[PDB]
Structures are given as C-alpha cells and as structure tokens.
Design a protein around this motif. Sequence first.
Motif, PDB file in Angstrom:
ATOM      1  N   UNK A 118       0.833  -1.175   0.000  1.00  0.00           N
ATOM      2  CA  UNK A 118       0.000   0.000   0.000  1.00  0.00           C
ATOM      3  C   UNK A 118       0.883   1.247   0.000  1.00  0.00           C
ATOM      4  N   UNK A 119       0.543   2.222  -0.862  1.00  0.00           N
ATOM      5  CA  UNK A 119       1.254   3.485  -0.877  1.00  0.00           C
ATOM      6  C   UNK A 119       0.705   4.355   0.262  1.00  0.00           C
ATOM      7  N   UNK A 120       1.458   5.354   0.715  1.00  0.00           N
ATOM      8  CA  UNK A 120       0.960   6.267   1.750  1.00  0.00           C
ATOM      9  C   UNK A 120      -0.199   7.147   1.284  1.00  0.00           C
ATOM     10  N   UNK A 121      -0.105   7.609   0.041  1.00  0.00           N
ATOM     11  CA  UNK A 121      -1.099   8.502  -0.542  1.00  0.00           C
ATOM     12  C   UNK A 121      -1.318   8.097  -2.001  1.00  0.00           C
ATOM     13  N   UNK A 122      -2.572   7.998  -2.416  1.00  0.00           N
ATOM     14  CA  UNK A 122      -2.910   7.894  -3.839  1.00  0.00           C
ATOM     15  C   UNK A 122      -3.840   9.020  -4.240  1.00  0.00           C
ATOM     16  N   UNK A 123      -3.507   9.745  -5.305  1.00  0.00           N
ATOM     17  CA  UNK A 123      -4.421  10.747  -5.861  1.00  0.00           C
ATOM     18  C   UNK A 123      -5.064  10.196  -7.110  1.00  0.00           C
ATOM     19  N   UNK A 124      -6.387  10.379  -7.223  1.00  0.00           N
ATOM     20  CA  UNK A 124      -7.124   9.823  -8.357  1.00  0.00           C
ATOM     21  C   UNK A 124      -8.265  10.724  -8.835  1.00  0.00           C
ATOM     22  N   UNK A 125      -8.459  10.758 -10.154  1.00  0.00           N
ATOM     23  CA  UNK A 125      -9.576  11.448 -10.796  1.00  0.00           C
ATOM     24  C   UNK A 125     -10.894  10.836 -10.421  1.00  0.00           C
ATOM     25  N   UNK A 128     -12.778   7.251 -11.638  1.00  0.00           N
ATOM     26  CA  UNK A 128     -11.900   6.176 -12.033  1.00  0.00           C
ATOM     27  C   UNK A 128     -11.910   5.098 -10.954  1.00  0.00           C
ATOM     28  N   UNK A 129     -11.707   3.855 -11.377  1.00  0.00           N
ATOM     29  CA  UNK A 129     -11.625   2.746 -10.457  1.00  0.00           C
ATOM     30  C   UNK A 129     -10.210   2.598  -9.885  1.00  0.00           C
ATOM     31  N   UNK A 130     -10.131   2.036  -8.683  1.00  0.00           N
ATOM     32  CA  UNK A 130      -8.886   1.918  -7.935  1.00  0.00           C
ATOM     33  C   UNK A 130      -8.680   0.516  -7.334  1.00  0.00           C
ATOM     34  N   UNK A 131      -7.534  -0.095  -7.635  1.00  0.00           N
ATOM     35  CA  UNK A 131      -7.166  -1.406  -7.087  1.00  0.00           C
ATOM     36  C   UNK A 131      -5.932  -1.279  -6.219  1.00  0.00           C
ATOM     37  N   UNK A 132      -6.088  -1.542  -4.926  1.00  0.00           N
ATOM     38  CA  UNK A 132      -4.939  -1.580  -4.046  1.00  0.00           C
ATOM     39  C   UNK A 132      -4.769  -2.993  -3.459  1.00  0.00           C
ATOM     40  N   UNK A 133      -3.519  -3.366  -3.151  1.00  0.00           N
ATOM     41  CA  UNK A 133      -3.173  -4.716  -2.728  1.00  0.00           C
ATOM     42  C   UNK A 133      -2.093  -4.695  -1.656  1.00  0.00           C
ATOM     43  N   UNK A 204      -9.572  14.279  -7.162  1.00  0.00           N
ATOM     44  CA  UNK A 204      -9.798  15.544  -7.869  1.00  0.00           C
ATOM     45  C   UNK A 204     -10.907  15.349  -8.896  1.00  0.00           C
TER      46      UNK A 204
END
Lengths: 207, 207
Positions: A118-125, A128-133, A204
């Motif tokens: 997992x990243x500390x921060x994710x920025x996304x439009x 949009x769909x998001x997959x974290x693992x 955003x």
Amino acid sequence: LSATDLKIQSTAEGIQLYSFVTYYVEDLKVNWSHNGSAIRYSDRVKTGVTGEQIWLQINEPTPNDKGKYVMELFDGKTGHQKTVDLSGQAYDEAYAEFQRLKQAAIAEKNRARVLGGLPDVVTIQEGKALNLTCNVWGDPPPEVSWLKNEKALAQTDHCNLKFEAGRTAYFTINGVSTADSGKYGLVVKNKYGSETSDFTVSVFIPE
Amino acid sequence: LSATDLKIQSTAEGIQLYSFVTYYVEDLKVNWSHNGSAIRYSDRVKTGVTGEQIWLQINEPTPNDKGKYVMELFDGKTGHQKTVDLSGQAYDEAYAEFQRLKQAAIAEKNRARVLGGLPDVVTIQEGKALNLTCNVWGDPPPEVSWLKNEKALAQTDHCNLKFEAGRTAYFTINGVSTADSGKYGLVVKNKYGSETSDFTVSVFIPE
C-alpha cells in the motif's frame, strides 16, 4: 593474558559457551575439545571469536553434546586453558531455557505482519476505479480488517475488500467518488501479534 | 414547404437516404417508394423522422436495393416529393464506404481498452513495497507493455510486471527507491486498437 571462566548461555538456536579475553590480544590461537577430543565442526557446531569474546555454538543440543568442554588459548608467550562441565543441572537448565527461547523465536518469526503493497497517498480522478493490494504474513494465517477514519469498514460492491490464501488483501473501489476520499487502514492480527498499514485516498474532480 | 434534395449516406449498418424539410412536419404524412412501389418495411429497411430529418435506412444493402427512391410529403390533397437514383457509381461508392464503416464499428466495439485500476499518482515512503493493478479488456484479449518516462520498461525481480488471463496487469515494486520514481504508463493493444493508462510514482525519503 587472562580469560573469564567459561559461561553457558542458552539461545533460540541452542547452547553456547564463551569466555572473554582480558585487555586485547592480536593472534590468540584457539583449540576446543569435548570430553578430551577435538571437535569436528559443522553448520550445527561452530566456534568463533568476536573481538575478545571466544565462543562455541552448539545448535540443537542433544545428550550427545553433554560433558567436559576445554577452551585452550595461546598468545605466543603463554598458554591458558578454561574448562566447563556441560552436565547435570547446568545442562538441564540450559536445555530447558533453549527450548523456551526457541518457542519465543517461532512467535517472532510467525507474528502477523504487513509485508508491503500500500502506498501512503494515492491521488485519483473522480470516477476512475482503484485497485490496491497488501501482502500480509502470519502463521497461523492472520485475520484482516479495514478501517476508514479509524472506524471499522464493511465490504460493499462499491468499495470491495477481499482476502485470499491468508496472504493477500485486496481493496477495490469501482469508481472513486469524493465521498470515497479519506484515511484508510488495514489491520492484520494473529495470536502472536498485529500490524497496521495506513493510506490516504484523495480525489480531484475532472472537467 | 421546402425540402432538401435527397442525399445518400453510408452508415456502419448500411445506406441511408434522407431529406431535411426546411419547414416543419406536424400532422404530415410521409410515404417512401422504391421504383414506384410502396416500401415493405422490416428490421432491415426502416423509415423515421428526427426533427426535420426525414430518413430511410437500408441495412445490409445489396444490388437488389438499387433503384429510384421517392419521398412523398403529403399535407391533405397536396404532395411535395423528392427523388433519388440509387444505382451505378452512387451505389458502388455508398456500398464500399458502408463496408469500411461496418468494419470500423467492429474495431470500436472490440478494441483493447483500460477498464480501470491505476491511480493518477501515488506517494510512497522510500523503501516500502508497492502493488498496482490495471483491469483491461479486448476481443481478442490484448497484450500489454509498460513505459517509464516514455521508454519501454522490462520486468526484473525488482520492478515486476505480470499479465494474467488476458485481463489483469500487475505492477509490483519490491522496495521503492527514489530511482523508481517517475511517470509510468501501461499500453494495452489488440488488432482493433489500443489505450494507455498513465500513473506517476513519487517518493519521499524517511528519517
């Protein structure tokens, strides 16, 4: 020259004997015997020096390893030998202490852990769909739970949470809205311990 | 009451003929004929009105559809009609274009695409592992490749790229260093077309 009397020390791996040399010598030749015989060395039984600590590691000891240990030293001018009996009470306690330390190490090796992902921060439009693992570890296999703003998070079809093979936790958002932004956490837990991984999702809004 | 000359338009489904009534149709009848006979309608040959556009759609046309088309606008005991001859070079061209547009629609439908998964940017502490996942689709299933700073990226043990079941692309960095930061892209492709998904990886150095 001088060496402290030989000490018996239980470790997680077995029993070691050691003696500390007094005030620095720069080529002490060392010879260890067991019941009057030279010790054949292996990955199981090994000897070394760490500074002025002269030692012998007997991994996974058996009654076979009991008896008289002599440490023989030579500095060039003078000889010196130290002796210890790895027998009776001395062996009973050390063997017993070994076993407990071995079992403690199993706890430390097998406690539940976040391995990474997992990243500390994710920025996304937005939209949009998001997959974290997250890769996790535990023996016995751990439990995972997720948090949002430090409170328990349930899986929905929208923000979906899956956990497979006691190893892999998936976090999937099918179209991230501003409402999905926030501070999330994964927690893994088993009988030996517990770890957390935190991440922020920020959004955003597009044109 | 004025109408534009009938024009012939190729579509992905066939050939359409249409006029625009520069005025307007309220309770106004419209009949189409082919070689002076009334038109049999089906799911292959359709007629409709969209605002001032009066149209006839001939799906999957053959040379048997060639001939004189009349469009009759009828307001009581008065008719305004338009004629077009769908034959020879006019037909041949409209058919060729129809074929080309029909094949474009197959490509539009089945071209490789990004369904989602990747965030626009991630921020991660240097040394932490990162898992990113992209869901893709095509018919036929696409192939994928990756870019870093607009250059081909090759899978290593450190920056590992896998692609499973023709539909899930995995990007894994085993301990993100600052050298791993940058603008990355996933390129998905099949015989019908392609798409890229961009993501930035940024790093901060911990205490």
